[PDB]
Amino acid sequence: GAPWWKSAVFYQVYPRSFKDTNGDGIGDFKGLTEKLDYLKGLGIDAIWINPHYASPNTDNGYDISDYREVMKEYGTMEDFDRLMAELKKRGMRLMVDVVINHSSDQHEWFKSSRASKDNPYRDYYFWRDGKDGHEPNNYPSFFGGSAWEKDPVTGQYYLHYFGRQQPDLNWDTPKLREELYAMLRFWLDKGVSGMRFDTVATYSKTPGFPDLTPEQMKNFAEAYTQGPNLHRYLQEMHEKVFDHYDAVTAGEIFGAPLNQVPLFIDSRRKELDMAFTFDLIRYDRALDRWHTIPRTLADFRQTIDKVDAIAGEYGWNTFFLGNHDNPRAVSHFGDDRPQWREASAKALATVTLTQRGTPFIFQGDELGMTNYPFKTLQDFDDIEVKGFFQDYVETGKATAEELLTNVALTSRNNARTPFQWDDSANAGFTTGKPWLKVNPNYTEINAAREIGDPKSVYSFYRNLISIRHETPALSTGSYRDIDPSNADVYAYTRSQDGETYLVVVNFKAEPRSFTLPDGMHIAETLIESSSPAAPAAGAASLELQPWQSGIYKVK
Template sequence: MIGQSRAASAAQTGTGRAWWKEAVIYEIYPRSFKDSNGDGIGDLPGILEKLPYIRDLGVDTIWLAPIFQSPNRDNGYDISDYRAIMPEFGTMDDFERLMAKASSLGIRIIMDLVVNHTSDQHPWFQKSRASKDSPYRDYYIWRDSAQGHPPNNWPSVWGGSAWAFEPETASSYLHLFSPQQPDLNWDNPAVREEVFSIMKFWLDKGVSGFRMDVITMISKMPSFRDMTPEELKAPEYVYAAGPHLHTYLREMNDRVLSHYDVMTVGEAYGMHAQDIPLFTDSARRELDMVFAFDIVHVDRQGWRKVAWPLSKLKEIYAAAGRPRSPDSWNTVFLDNHDQPRAVSRFGNDSAPFREVSAKAIGTMLLTQCGTPFIYQGEELGMTNLPFDGLDDFEDVQVPLQWDTRVKRQGVDPDAFLESLKGLGRDNARSPMQWDASRHAGFTTAEKPWYRVNPNYTEINAQDCVSNAGSVYHYFRDLIALRRKYPALIYGTYQDQDPDHSAVFFYSRQLESSKILILINMSDRGFTYDTPLLARASLLLSNMRHRGVTQDVTWLAPWEARVYRA
């Protein structure tokens, strides 16, 4: 129940169980989900209209990407008013109607908390930049400087300097991302009070928690020294090493979060896997979960898209499956608004393998250790977009990256563009494909805010819902299976064949209940026999096998099976 304290919730469970550990969370990127008023932009009434679709999938929690007032330089991740709804998305009344309808359907909503930085249009920043004597000056991070001579050599994560010069006050402000996203000064207690007040505002409206954008970067290195050449290769690890990070998270928990039965998931950008327990061990009173990036970085080296062996994926999941602390919890995701489409990345989005491989990697997503996050359209097997050139990209970071990599560093433009096509964030941001009508049923406008993937006539929700053998229905079955067998939520993890180059075979076990998951992660079929399946019964398969299957030794390309041992 909203408003119940965490202490009371923990006392009731007593076993470390929690609703957010058992949840299946569905991320909605509002701008691209469903347009209800024909302006080409998704909105809150459009989300409300589609809540039954989400409920029927079996999802019980929605993560809303930012819906706050914003000039939209970074599609809502540059906030100018934390207590107002972006007019393109609707009104506060629309939000409250969405909350009420979701609650009636048994669906919780978590919000995106973006408090490492604001928009440069936020009143705080407008007052901060006006004068060195402004009471808001210390809400942000300023250093005296001359034009063309930033205070240090820190780079923006997206390219170029992390400092923007303001001639009116002969000083520069810090922005770890775009110049339109100035970083807040969390060392100022007044800033922390503002953030805590914003959090209470939304929690008191009934939201069930927060996804916290780049929360690992809120504490800055106090000396602001130059980075070494080695540090400049991966500056995000410097930005995430601020000395007060954990102090500020504990303060947030003590002041706000501990007074509500809610969940928190932090974007752990710049953190190493071994540091995760520092955030998620419940005894430390910081966060419930974090998004680690090991899996979604398996196919990239810097800006380059690279081939990846299955062994690397197995190693990451095996490490995640080992208890890191007495009550640490994982997230499981392959896809989100910042990542390319999962089937295009981890599966094979070409015929005849798209559907079966989307089901195979969906099997992996929903049977690993931790709370699974599904991104809109993943349950349909939506694919990456086709891109012809640089002008096809909408993402604010693309021109910054192009300027840094190609113009300044001399990276081959064709090679950079090719990697951008496979790894770019725009792949996930094309409109949701609802049906085979014009603009995929996303909008009745003459032109949507961003282009629709041309394969929408073949891949859309209407077709998937009406087809019992679709990716959508397979996701439904997986979610139902996860809820039926607690071993798939709370069970231990064991890789049963870590050396096989194509088969991912692992188990989840809780007391005497043991589930075996077998996935062929390749385009080729082969014979695979193991005594572990001799007495196992098949619960689910993307090839629609049924019954006891000890005689089935042939694994078709991308075949996935879930057994009860």
């Protein structure tokens, strides 16, 4: 039998930018709770929320100062409990974000740890002497400069793969692991249905911390996933935690080669249930994670093919076209120009909700929200781009103008602009001043305008979700790309229990033709976007409008 999460449709809420209810410009728990009916009406089964714990917000939640307290900005523990209860009343499930590769430098564990060399919290983190007057080794950080930061109190350096205020936790210390396990139980005991593990592949560090080779240096993310005890630790966490609950686990597998992924998600291995990979979402990103590289539909579909393959029989993938760290789906994979935005957004919706795996819809993509028109430096404000300035502008590798030109297309802030609820002040997100500026296009792109319009992107998403829910093959069915080399039209089948469905999506802003495989004919049309007429029963080919998508039952 297949678990509930294989056929579930997930929705990612970024609480900071979802709904503000006290005018401070920051989204909160009360805001999310007020909007559960909206998400329920959309057809959402489960919600993944980004970190909601106590945090100095150097990385908007990903620097946690206390794992057993909620973030002051979002509300109180009572607000969280109310959120939990209100989700339960609607039969909805909650997936929380788990950030245990690192903590905030303001966490009490680290305050104690850094205070001396001989305290019981010293080995909760990684402290090392520098060498040759410099850092312990040549480890660079993802968020700028060295991954080693010297502390004048002890004269040693502490490790941080990410922000300087995000010191890595030491999984080699059994006592630390037990603290994390107890922490997970704290939230699981409250009834949490899911856990998403932030940078799950970097938990294990390399013994002795030897220097990275020049080859390794070019893509150091990979080396950070080559910890010798990685899967040993993940298996222990399952044994001591997940094996005692009925929660689904998902891993942000960052930096790891696709061929390593089955080690995380093979159900027989008793590690994680689902994989978030970077292959598709970063398929057109350069190695520096800020430059863009031109790609076609052929690249797009072939990546999906590869990702689906490693899932195999015993593993499972998530599928997403957007998250909190990426440009908007329609801007990134579609055509966000005014005359093509809605059509392409619907086409991407069709793709999202007919992939093999568990789809995650990022907040606002169901409205067809786009990239933000960056202007000022302040618009880009984010710890990652700040690191890019440190590593690329200060070093003279690139000008500020060059960086911003590119980052405008790849900025994480593209996904973090306030959710657009209506056409009131700041799109009805807040009564005050939003922490990040609202996209000006909210006047024509907002929830209120699209709910009432049956032709909207929202209604199309809602119809697709309904269709996927009623059609097992669209979730747990097999997957087959009709023509991996085709760069114009995306076409594939989903099959289960003798029932085969055909998905055809035109990725061009021009009319295209599509011929069905030999011996395959249209039986029914389930749904289409931007199509003036459904195909006749028994059709062996389709005529596609620009950006037309469709789901067909075949015979």
